[PDB]
């Protein structure tokens, strides 16, 4: 039942078609639902009346069918356009759009053929086990405010590390992992730490 969207469109169109042909059994006020039972039983001027009732009824039935198919086709067009967009953006590329191609961080996708439609297998990265760390917007060194170059400054309770935002892989805070902007008296919540300079032990 998971693959229900394609089954529903197949059944919905099949039903509309069956509905149309069943209207041929209606008389729409005519003496008979059967065209031959009008023509063979009534004199021409009378037959011409009963036949117009069937024509009007059947024509109206067909117009209804076509209108519903035409509106439905627009719905399908919209879906097809979305499917075309997802393939070009998620199969032929890597989407940056949240929940566009699955929950989580999009990595890639694979198209699959399906009757009257397309199925996409969306491969996403989803964060799992997590922990709380103490954080700070900046670190104060020699009176200067240091901000993470790409990551967040966090503490395990005794030591401060710079960690990539989406995965806990802590590193020693060095002058390569941080940039300096302004002094320690501006940033709210700045903490005191030591920023390592790789040159010092080699100088």
């Amino acid at each position: 039942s998971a693959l229900g969207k394609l089954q529903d469109v197949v059944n919905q169109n099949a039903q509309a078609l069956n509905t149309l042909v069943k209207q041929l059994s209606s008389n729409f006020g005519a003496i008979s639902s059967v065209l031959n039972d009008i023509l063979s039983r009534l004199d021409p001027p009378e037959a011409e009346v009963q036949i117009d009732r069937l024509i009007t009824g059947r024509l109206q039935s067909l117009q209804t069918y076509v209108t519903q198919q035409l509106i439905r086709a627009a719905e399908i067009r919209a879906s097809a356009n979305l499917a075309a967009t997802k393939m070009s953006e998620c199969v032929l590329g890597q989407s940056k759009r949240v929940d566009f191609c699955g929950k989580g961080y999009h990595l890639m996708s694979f198209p699959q053929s399906a009757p009257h439609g397309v199925v996409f297998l969306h491969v996403t990265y989803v964060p799992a086990q997590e922990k709380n760390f103490t954080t700070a917007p900046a670190i104060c060194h020699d009176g200067k405010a240091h901000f993470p170059r790409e990551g967040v400054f966090v503490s395990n309770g005794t030591h401060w590390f710079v960690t990539q935002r989406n995965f806990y892989e802590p590193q020693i805070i060095t002058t390569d992992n941080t940039f300096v902007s302004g002094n320690c008296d501006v940033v709210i919540g700045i903490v005191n730490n030591t920023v390592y300079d790789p040159l010092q032990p080699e100088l």
């Binding site: 998971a2 169109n13 099949a14 067909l62 997802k86 996403t124 954080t135």
Partner: protein, 87 residues
Amino acid sequence: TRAGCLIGAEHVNNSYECDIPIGAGICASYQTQSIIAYTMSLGAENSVAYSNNSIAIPTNFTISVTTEILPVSMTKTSVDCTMYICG
């Protein structure tokens, strides 16, 4: 209820995620035995431990593959009105 008069279902004060929707916030389900009526839950309550100096960082991850099904086309059907209407 607001949706109408529901007969045969037992109303309870326990909310559950919605199974068979009725309307106006009311859903029904089969418990194990009888059919019950309840106000639907919108999801589990989860308060994050927000603090001005606390951040949560994932230490592990999983690769999740989900399936999305989209229709592309409908039956390519047509009818000749001059045969359908007449014969």
